[PDB]
Structure 1
Amino acid sequence: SEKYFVKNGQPHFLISGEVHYFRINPKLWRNHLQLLKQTGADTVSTYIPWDWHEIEEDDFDFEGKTHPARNLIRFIKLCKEENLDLIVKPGPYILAEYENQGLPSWLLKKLSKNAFALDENGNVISPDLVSYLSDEFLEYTFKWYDKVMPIISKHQKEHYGPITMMQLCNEIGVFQWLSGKSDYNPKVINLYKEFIIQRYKTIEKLNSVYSTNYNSFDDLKAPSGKIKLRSDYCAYFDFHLFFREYYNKYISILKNKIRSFGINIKLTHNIPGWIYGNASELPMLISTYSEIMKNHPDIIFGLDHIPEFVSFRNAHSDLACNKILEAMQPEAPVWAAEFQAGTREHHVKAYAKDLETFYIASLAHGIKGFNYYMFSQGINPEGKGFYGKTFYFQTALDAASNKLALYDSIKKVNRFIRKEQKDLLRTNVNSEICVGFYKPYFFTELISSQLLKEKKLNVEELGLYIDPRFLREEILFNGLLRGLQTLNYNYDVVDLENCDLKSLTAYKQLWITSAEFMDAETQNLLSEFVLNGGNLILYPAVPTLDNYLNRCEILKNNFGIEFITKDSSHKVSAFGIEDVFTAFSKKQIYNDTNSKPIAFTQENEICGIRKKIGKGELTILGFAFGYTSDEHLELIDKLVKLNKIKRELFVSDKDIQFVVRENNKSRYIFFLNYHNERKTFNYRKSSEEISIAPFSYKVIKENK
């Protein structure tokens, strides 16, 4: 049932280290590789920078003719001689704090204006930033692939070379995320028009959905500026859908070109979204790959994990990300393509004792492989660094292959992983809670994000009051998921899109965090789930609109629900918990015919009910809570206990986190102390008395 990497027909924990040959003295290449191998790592990973190897137009150096660190061929040869597999990442974009993000200077000087990503006025967004589908960009990308891909092909495992995986490009769409700017290149906009024509067929159909007054598709302009009208929201929503198809068109073109060279190894991509040691925005980035993930079963996405520190402040980020990736990519192992080792930023410390706990927590949280990023520090050649001379700090090895504090932490964790991998990789957690992932709430990177300074989405101007980004960050990510992890309740996440009803019935509860809008297919799915015998917890709103904010009351009508939205105090009572702080004055006040009232406003109006529908159960809360008080943890605990869900262990200290991973023969108990306090506690199933240091861990094995 578990998904994991395989070597010699047995479960294999992929342990990779990132070592940038182009940033290391080649006299020390062998020493770096030997020290990486001696930690128990099996794989080494690097970019192959286009700028570094196509030194002038149609002048390629892979042999160190012009600089010894351009000897890619020797580096590949050394990986094989030192018994490491190799991951290669030839771009065209590498990012990696490399000047021009890896594109050649000669290329960026030579490209015409229409090869660049353009703002709505037709101005170049950045001299760094090409249009992914530019004819000229792809032609030059293809000429780079024509040189590097024959080398990669010849050095595949198949041909007793070390190369086992290749990444296509790097964090596709990350520049639109960080800037909050869409590419309005006329070639992109023509592709958007085609998408829209393909989707709606006639202007009459688009007008009926958007409430627009176009006489033809010629009238239609790409959305831009703030959303003022529901028609602007509709247009921006489809513009988000378009970019997900656009990114699939791009990676498909690279993939087909790669396959033409007989490259049959595993293809990868990498997911950004951490910043300042928080990952609450990474689900938005995962959502931009929805069309890639549906159309490429053979491309493995891995996570870029950048925790920076390890404490209760960010403990929930990596679990929530790993669970959402599992939801979106159920047929591949959850792995970290970039797994923090040292720090990209000198002033943002990465402590060995923090990262060691992160590595063990990551195992608890279901990770099946990782690539330490950066295992080895680099020195930027010839000022090719965007920032200073040095690439990364507090790594396992400095750029001269000096061992640093993190080295012995990685060796220790790797030795544990190698000892346990055969059993540990085959373990899962017993989740009786399912949490719905509704991707359209996440489709906002051009209008609502932590990184976008401008707020292009203001739901109150649309006659709404539940903002999807507030819902998905504060009520879901930092609220429910943080709360369940803090309470040591296992959950799984399920992608509600095309979701199999049969997959939902294993769970005792399904939790849906709902705004005022939800498509017909999802309202029908939740209707059928409850009628067939499921237990649904739904808050803060019964939805009444579809994704285009047109009337859709399927779930409301099927459940016999009636409500009025009314203003009250932020505080409610729920299940006899007084003073539960809620996000909104406006709440849903429910008619309680055939219902049990279970939550009350300060004036005793009914803002939550329970109800039997068909064979199933409904709990509807007409208010939004996250986790910002002890009453929130009390309320989640009461909700979980409605359907008699139990934690695996009794642990005497509530502030110890545990994860029980089991298969038929083996149990692992991961204890995690995310607190600056030496804790002593005892545990038993639902002497045995253990002490854990601050920001530390303990793993116990039990045979069944």
Structure 2
Amino acid sequence: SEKYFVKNGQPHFLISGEVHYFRINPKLWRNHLQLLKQTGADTVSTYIPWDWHEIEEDDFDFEGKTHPARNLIRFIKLCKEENLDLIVKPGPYILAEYENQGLPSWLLKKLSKNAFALDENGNVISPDLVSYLSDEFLEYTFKWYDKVMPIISKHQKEHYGPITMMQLCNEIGVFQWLSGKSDYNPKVINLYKEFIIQRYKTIEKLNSVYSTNYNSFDDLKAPSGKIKLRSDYCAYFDFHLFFREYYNKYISILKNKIRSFGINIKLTHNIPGWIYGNASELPMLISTYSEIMKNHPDIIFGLDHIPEFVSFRNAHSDLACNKILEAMQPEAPVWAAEFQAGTREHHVKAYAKDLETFYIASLAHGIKGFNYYMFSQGINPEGKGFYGKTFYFQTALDAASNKLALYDSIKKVNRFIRKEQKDLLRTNVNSEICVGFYKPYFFTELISSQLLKEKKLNVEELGLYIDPRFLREEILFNGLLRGLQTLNYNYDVVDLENCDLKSLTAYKQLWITSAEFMDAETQNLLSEFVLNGGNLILYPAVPTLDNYLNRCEILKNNFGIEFITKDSSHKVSAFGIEDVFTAFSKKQIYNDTNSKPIAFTQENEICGIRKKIGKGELTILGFAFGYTSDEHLELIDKLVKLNKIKRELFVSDKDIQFVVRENNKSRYIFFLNYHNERKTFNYRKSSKSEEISIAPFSYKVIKENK
């Protein structure tokens, strides 16, 4: 039951390369495509920039009449002649370091002020940032679609053309996020007001949930400024729910317009979130797509992976991202829409010997397809570069089509993939550990993020102590997920929203990283999980509130837990491990009733217990740890061993990472050395040892038959 791309009823590993026809001498297009095809790639991918093709208002060139590199039609025909399928991405936004993020200069000069994204003061956030549902923006976007979409429709696979997939716009919300400010455009504020009225029906029902005293819906304003009251937190939480409906409305309007041209190819979107070589904020960005992914089972999201280097400093980012995409999109293959090749930034180097290891690690970490971004360097024509004349460096081909060092790395990886794809695509890893993904902890991009200008959320002003962003970044992403990968314990991630109990019962352990708040549905689901036979690990808090910070003690009551919150030293003992550094002075102190106490404060008060409940097992730790000391890995190891979970291999060097992937025919062992040390080690299957030497920042792959 792996999800993978299919060609002609067989597993197909999607290998694409990004080649920007608009940034390459058209006399050299065929050579770029030939050299991409010779790496074993089956697809080529490109933006079709609106600014490049609508050269003035209502003046379109797709044929090279005004500039040879405007000859889109020729580029499509060459893709077909060179036996490559094509991914097209006509925007309206492309980003792509193209001036004005791809929008025509003539359009941005003509639009009225009310087309732009606006701050709470009514000021333009950025002269190239439109409001997505601006009437004026969508009118011109539709006139662009009227010209580019008939060309895309004509050249679809079903009409014997090369076009197999199309991206809608580009990384929806990426500008809101990087600008560090949210959109208060009056189109947006009016849709928000309709959303609130639809959700609550009467001002009395809203007031009962928020604890506000409004006389009418007319008194309610879009939340702005810092959160000081639980009522401000409630208003912002609904504002987050509203933006997820808003982005779903935007993509819905583009999709409906596209389908009217007879375009039946696969539609895609692309997920932002890596910055400075780590992806700890990507889960927040993927959370902004929650309503798109529920409403559009036919739009496949892929990841935009930008590792920059490949070391222990970022080894956990790509696996945690691939797992979280699978959790939110379990019916489609995990794929990278943009899979780092070379570097966007001259000063931020991308070494072939790093990216080659990233590519192999991505296979170990369950990737099923990717688009090398950028396969071909470009030169910006006509001053169209946002930041300088050259587009990307250290790619597979330079802009002239010369092979660079990365070319042989990509050929090596592609060769292995083509040899193995029939088995490799069908392989699974045996995960006995499931980690819960509780989307509401991620809904903070308006109030708390690595990129937001103003920190609007301070939980201590709300009488709370567990910050949801600290929890999801340090206790979950950089803590538990980093620790399991480092310890070589396989895990899966599951979305807790509308989660079937039967999709949890296959695991030996469910791990829940909990704040003081959790909705009644999720508190009930976890209660039933344990009563019915599940083994639950829960920390750092039993929640006592719902998503609106109103009382909800369902899980606490169903588990027969009594506790008080007390201050103590950061250090606790747990399972006989002394001096376990914890994030908070405040801890939950549990009554010892019908339980085994397994963690103790410096005053020897009980801050963790284990108990049997119905047919299940509960382990609660009333303290927070991520992975900032060796004791944290010893603790994760102790917790995993409570249900006798074993690693697949005994490996003599604990700093070697491995993944075993297998199906009925084939076993693949991936060894990953994320460290600057030549390592010699030995290993054997958990149920005569082989010796292996591995270079710094390198990999080995062993195939076994049966």
SS at structure 2 position matched to 1:671: strand
Offset from partner CA, 1:347-392 (integer Å, 9 cap, x none): 1000000000000000000000000000001111111111000010
CA contact (8 A) 1:180 1:445 kept: no
Distance in 2, matches of 1:241 and 1:220, equals 16
Moved more, 111-120 or 423-432: 111-120
Q: CA deviation at 1:120?
A: 1.1
Partner of 2:696: 694
Offset from partner CA, 1:25-50 (integer Å, 9 cap, x none): 10110110011001110000000000
Q: CA deviation at 1:640?
A: 0.3
In the alignment of these two chains, the number of paired residues is 704
Q: TM-score, normalised by structure 1?
A: 1.00
CA contact (8 A) 2:125 2:179 kept: no
Distance in 1, matches of 2:500 and 2:181, equals 36
Q: CA deviation at 1:691?
A: 0.6
Offset from partner CA, 1:494-523 (integer Å, 9 cap, x none): 000000001000000000000000000000
Distance in 2, matches of 1:161 and 1:110, equals 36
Distance in 1, matches of 2:112 and 2:579, equals 62
Q: CA deviation at 1:126?
A: 1.0
CA contact (8 A) 1:569 1:585 kept: yes
Partner of 1:131: 131
Offset from partner CA, 1:226-269 (integer Å, 9 cap, x none): 11111010000110110000000000000010000010000000
Distance in 1, matches of 2:495 and 2:543, equals 18
CA contact (8 A) 1:227 1:458 kept: yes
Partner of 2:476: 476
Q: CA deviation at 1:123?
A: 1.5
Q: CA deviation at 1:578?
A: 0.4
Segments ≥4 residues shifted beyond 4 Å: none
Distance in 2, matches of 1:206 and 1:378, equals 54
Q: CA deviation at 1:179?
A: 2.1
Q: CA deviation at 1:7?
A: 1.0
SS at structure 1 position matched to 2:286: helix
Q: CA deviation at 1:177?
A: 1.1
CA contact (8 A) 2:436 2:511 kept: yes
Offset from partner CA, 1:286-318 (integer Å, 9 cap, x none): 000000000000000000000000000100000
Distance in 2, matches of 1:33 and 1:262, equals 28
Partner of 1:493: 493
Q: CA deviation at 1:2?
A: 0.6
CA contact (8 A) 2:475 2:624 kept: yes
Partner of 2:40: 40
Moved more, 577-586 or 118-127: 118-127
Q: CA deviation at 1:121?
A: 1.6
CA contact (8 A) 1:156 1:265 kept: yes
CA contact (8 A) 1:180 1:447 kept: no
Distance in 2, matches of 1:587 and 1:311, equals 34
SS at structure 1 position matched to 2:261: coil
Q: CA deviation at 1:593?
A: 0.8
CA contact (8 A) 1:672 1:697 kept: yes
Distance in 2, matches of 1:191 and 1:613, equals 46
Q: CA deviation at 1:703?
A: 1.8
Offset from partner CA, 1:70-96 (integer Å, 9 cap, x none): 000000000000110000000000000
Q: CA deviation at 1:124?
A: 1.4
SS at structure 2 position matched to 1:573: strand
Q: CA deviation at 1:453?
A: 3.3
Q: CA deviation at 1:452?
A: 1.5
SS at structure 2 position matched to 1:74: helix
Q: CA deviation at 1:402?
A: 1.0
Distance in 2, matches of 1:232 and 1:384, equals 43
SS at structure 2 position matched to 1:484: helix
Q: TM-score, normalised by structure 2?
A: 0.99
CA contact (8 A) 1:336 1:371 kept: yes
SS at structure 2 position matched to 1:479: helix
Which residues of 2 match residues 196-235 of structure 1 at below 5 A?
A: 196-235=196-235
Offset from partner CA, 1:473-512 (integer Å, 9 cap, x none): 0000000000000000000000000000010000000000
Distance in 1, matches of 2:38 and 2:97, equals 28
CA contact (8 A) 2:588 2:623 kept: yes
CA contact (8 A) 1:319 1:362 kept: yes
Structure 1 residues 453 and 134: alpha-carbon distance in aligned structure 2, compared to 1, 3 A threshold: closer
Q: CA deviation at 1:403?
A: 0.7
CA contact (8 A) 1:117 1:183 kept: yes
Partner of 1:92: 92
1:271 and 2:263 are equivalent in the alignment: no
Distance in 1, matches of 2:110 and 2:546, equals 47
Q: CA deviation at 1:21?
A: 0.4
CA contact (8 A) 2:653 2:681 kept: yes
Distance in 2, matches of 1:48 and 1:146, equals 14
Q: CA deviation at 1:337?
A: 0.1
Q: CA deviation at 1:125?
A: 1.3
Distance in 2, matches of 1:241 and 1:667, equals 44
SS at structure 1 position matched to 2:589: strand
Offset from partner CA, 1:445-475 (integer Å, 9 cap, x none): 1110111132111000110000000000000
Offset from partner CA, 1:143-166 (integer Å, 9 cap, x none): 000000000000011111100000
Q: CA deviation at 1:175?
A: 1.0
Partner of 1:371: 371
CA contact (8 A) 1:4 1:425 kept: yes
Distance in 2, matches of 1:702 and 1:235, equals 56
Offset from partner CA, 1:637-696 (integer Å, 9 cap, x none): 000000111111111111100001011121111000001111111111119111111100
SS at structure 1 position matched to 2:382: helix
Distance in 2, matches of 1:550 and 1:600, equals 30
CA contact (8 A) 2:181 2:453 kept: no
CA contact (8 A) 2:434 2:504 kept: yes
Partner of 1:316: 316
Distance in 1, matches of 2:53 and 2:479, equals 48
Moved more, 97-106 or 180-189: 180-189
SS at structure 2 position matched to 1:382: coil
1:5 and 2:11 are equivalent in the alignment: no
SS at structure 1 position matched to 2:283: helix
Distance in 1, matches of 2:601 and 2:399, equals 61
Distance in 2, matches of 1:151 and 1:606, equals 69
Distance in 2, matches of 1:7 and 1:640, equals 40
Partner of 2:549: 549
Which residues of 2 match residues 215-294 of structure 1 at below 5 A?
A: 215-294=215-294
CA contact (8 A) 1:357 1:697 kept: yes
Moved more, 29-38 or 171-180: 171-180
SS at structure 2 position matched to 1:178: helix
Q: CA deviation at 1:122?
A: 1.5
Distance in 1, matches of 2:177 and 2:207, equals 29
SS at structure 2 position matched to 1:383: coil
Distance in 2, matches of 1:671 and 1:356, equals 14
CA contact (8 A) 1:293 1:328 kept: yes
SS at structure 2 position matched to 1:333: coil
Offset from partner CA, 1:39-76 (integer Å, 9 cap, x none): 11000000000000000011000000000000000000
Distance in 2, matches of 1:181 and 1:487, equals 39
Distance in 1, matches of 2:453 and 2:561, equals 39
CA contact (8 A) 1:176 1:446 kept: no
Distance in 2, matches of 1:226 and 1:342, equals 40
Q: CA deviation at 1:180?
A: 2.8
SS at structure 1 position matched to 2:284: helix
1:703 and 2:705 are equivalent in the alignment: yes
